[PDB]
Amino acid sequence: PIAVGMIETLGFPAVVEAADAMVKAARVTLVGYEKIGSGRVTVIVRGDVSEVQASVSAGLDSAKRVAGGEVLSHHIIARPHENLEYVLPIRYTEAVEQFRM
Amino acid sequence: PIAVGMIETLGFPAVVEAADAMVKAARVTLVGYEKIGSGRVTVIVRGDVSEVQASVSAGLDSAKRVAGGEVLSHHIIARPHENLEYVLPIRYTEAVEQFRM
Amino acid sequence: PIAVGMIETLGFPAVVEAADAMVKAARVTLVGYEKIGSGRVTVIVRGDVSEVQASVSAGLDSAKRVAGGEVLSHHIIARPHENLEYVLPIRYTEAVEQFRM
Amino acid sequence: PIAVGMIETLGFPAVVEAADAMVKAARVTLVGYEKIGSGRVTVIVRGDVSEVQASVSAGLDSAKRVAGGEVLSHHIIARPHENLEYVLPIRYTEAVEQFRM
Amino acid sequence: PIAVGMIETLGFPAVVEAADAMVKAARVTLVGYEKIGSGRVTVIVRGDVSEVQASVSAGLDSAKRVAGGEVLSHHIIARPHENLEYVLPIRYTEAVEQFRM
Amino acid sequence: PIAVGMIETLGFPAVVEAADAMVKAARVTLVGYEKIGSGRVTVIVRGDVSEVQASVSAGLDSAKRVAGGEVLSHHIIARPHENLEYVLPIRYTEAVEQFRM
């Protein structure tokens, strides 16, 4: 029952700061980086919901301070249906298994 | 004769919530995630039409409450022509066979 | 010398409905789904010119009734040059031969 | 050294009409279809310069009559440097060799 | 080290003209064509800085004369750091070695 | 623990100049070039934080002087979490190892 947190920014430098602040703020794993066009990019973290809450809060705080930085949207899902794991890029991957809690 | 339900959002975090709420609300299978540019992303579910109708209703309800969320369009097709299955990314895939009802 | 009909929408769910209405309304084969960016997507049907004309008219009517539905452009070519078949994605493919008429 | 003709449209159905009108109007070969984002797509023809001029002129006339159709730009180069052949998608390919004049 | 020249236009027909004009005007090699979205495309030349200077001036002049033509930006770097050669698409490639000077 | 510097421009020629000025201004390695659409492109450097500061400052100064040049955003992270290395295109690669300090 692993939670998922997401921060979407306009521009790449701000999404890197969001990711960095998120994994430094709490026990979460950065598993994803998704581009959907219009300069909209999202970073996705997984972990226990309380950790994810703290991560996202810290990521939002730091991302908005980036020069030219813009946060567009953000969301947490405490208990994502496991169907999502097999369709959307929110899942752990072999390349980040070392960073799982 | 399996129905198809679709919710299109502006932004990725909102489309994840759309998918989550859809598959939790009724007996439907999330089979697809489609990017067409300009931040427009769609999630696609299959199931009996009445299930799909309930899922789409719940998905719209929750996606709109996502911070920075916006729903652009949505649609249900009760009985899609099977020609659509071989051209459009709405078909069941091997990766989600385990979630079929 | 088989005709080709095309409906371009802004948004994915309406293009799926466009495709559905087309192949249900008359004797045409859905052969293509083309993304050119910025939310612009086209579905492409082949068949006798009179069928194609019936399909497109229906597809336009149906797509516009989609919540958030929008049509950008549409066109029919009765006798497309065969040179187009080898450059533009309007040709029959193996995966839809079973739907040829 | 063979002339190159190009018509860029907003929307896909229009660019298909452009191509069709071009290869029907004179002795040219459709060799390329190029997407650069923003809904801008270009079709590219090769042939003798006076043929290319007649093809482009006809393509411009037909494409603009497409419902929802817009021509964005167009150009003819009578004698393109052969360096362009190896970098830009304007060259003949194996798939259209049967349509060389 | 070898200079690099760049012209970015809105629209594909205009970069083709920019490329053609550049390689005809001086001793430079066309090595690259780069799409970054929103219809922005750049053609890249390499050569002695004085040559590149002449190529770019000619490309700018000719590109702006293209029907629907628009130049968005352009730049010359006389002596690019070799690090750029291994990251950005400005380097000579096998396909254009025959055109080096 | 190696710092990361990022400059995002609107347009490609300007991002090339940014990279060039960056690696020439201090001891940093250009490791990445990232496109996220809508003409937004970012160049990424690694090095000691004081070096990255000097490079980014110099890249910003030079990029804004490019004809049609436009900087959208920029950021420095002195001590990026190692998790980001396996998700975001900010890491060293084989192709640039010879330029590591």
Q: Fill in the DSSP letter of residue A96.
A: G
Experimentally, the structure was elucidated by X-ray
Residue B73 touches chain C, beta carbons under 8 Å = yes
Quick one: CA dihedral A56, A59, A65, A70, positive or negative?
negative
CA-to-CA distance for E6 and D87, rounded, in angstroms? Answer: 14
d(CA C12, CA C6): 15
CB atoms within 10 A of CB F17: 27
CB B21 within 8 A of CB A80: no
What does the domain layout of chain F look like in residue ranges? 1-101
Start-to-end CA span in chain E (Å): 13
Q: Would you state the structure tokens that stand for residue A20, as one six-digit string? A: 């960095």
Strands (E), F1-101: 3-10, 28-37, 40-47, 71-77
For residue A32, what are the β-bridge partners?
A: A44
Distance from B6 to chain C by nearest Cα, in Å? Answer: 6
C-alpha separations of E38 from A38, C8, F38 in Å:
9, 19, 5
**CA distance linking residue B60 with residue B56, whole number of Å:** 6
Contact B29, B92 (CB under 8 A): yes
Contact assignment for F88 to A19 by CB distance below 8 Å:
yes
Provide DSSP, A36-68: EETTEEEEEEEE-HHHHHHHHHHHHHHHTTSBT
Q: What is the largest CA-CA distance in chain C?
A: 38
* The two structure tokens encoding residue B83: 């020609």
CB contact set of B82 (below 8 Å; sequence gap of 6+):
none
Residue with structure tokens 């037909």?
D62
Sign, CA torsion A76/A79/A84/A89: positive
Neighbours of chain A (3+ CB pairs under 8 A): B, F
Strand arrangement, sheet containing B40-47: B29-35, B40-47, B3-10, B71-77
Closest-CA distance, F2 to chain A, in angstroms, reads 13
Angstrom distance (rounded) from CA F89 to CA F86 = 8
Minimal Cβ distance to F66: which of E40, E73, E88: E73
Interchain CB distance below 8 Å, C73 and D11: yes
Chains near C, with 3+ CB pairs < 8 A? B, D
Which residues face E73 on adjacent strands? Answer: E8
CB contact under 8 A, A96 and F83: yes
Nearest residue to B68 (alpha-carbon basis) of B5, B7, B13? B13
Which residue bears the tokens 């049967």?
D98
CATH of domain D1-101: 3.30.70.1710
Angle, vertex CA B84, rays to CA C19 and CA B4, nearest 5: 95
CB–CB of C41/D51 below 8 Å? no
Q: Do residue A38 and residue F38 have CB atoms under 8 angstroms apart?
A: yes
Buried b (16+ CB within 10 A) or exposed e, D49-82: bebbbbbbbbbbebbeebbebebbbbbbbeebbe
Query: What is the full DSSP assignment across D24-56?
Result: HHSSEEEEEEEEEETTEEEEEEEE-HHHHHHHH
AA letter at A9:
T
d(CA E25, CA E23) in angstroms, rounded, equals 6
Task: State the resolution, in angstroms.
Answer: 2.1
Q: How many residues does chain D have?
A: 101
A51/chain F closest Cα distance in angstroms = 16
Name every residue whose Cβ is closer than 8 Å to that of residue E80 and which is 6 or more positions away in sequence.
E1, E2, E3, E4, E90, F16, F20
In 3D, which of B4, B5, B11 has the Cα closest to residue B71?
B11
Angle at the Cα of A11 from the Cα atoms of A9 and A13, rounded to 5 degrees: 100
Top residue of C7, C8, C20 to mutate, by most chain B CBs within 10 Å, is C20
Q: Please report how the helices F49-63 and F12-25 are oriented relative to each other, as an axis angle in degrees rounded to 10.
A: 140
Question: Which pairing describes strands E40-47 and E3-10: parallel, antiparallel, or unpaired?
Answer: antiparallel
Q: Is E70 helix (H, G, I), strand (E, B) or coil?
A: coil
Beta bridge mates, A37: A40
With CB atoms and an 8 Å threshold, state whether B30 touches A83.
yes
Q: How far D87 CA sits from the closest chain E CA (Å)?
A: 6
Residue E58 has φ and ψ, to the nearest 5°, of -70, -40
Does the CB of C98 have a partner CB in chain D at under 8 Å? no
Do D41 and D8 contact (CB within 8 A), yes or no?
yes
- Identify the CA nearest to F42 among candidates F3, F90, F96: F90
Cα–Cα distance between A51 and A63 in angstroms, integer?
Answer: 18
Q: How far is it, in rounded angstroms, from Cα C67 to Cα E61?
A: 48
Q: What are the structure tokens assigned to F73, written together?
A: 């955003």
The arrangement of strands across the sheet holding D3-10 comes to D28-37, D40-47, D3-10, D70-77
CA distance E25 to C14: 49
F96/E86 Cβ within 8 A: yes
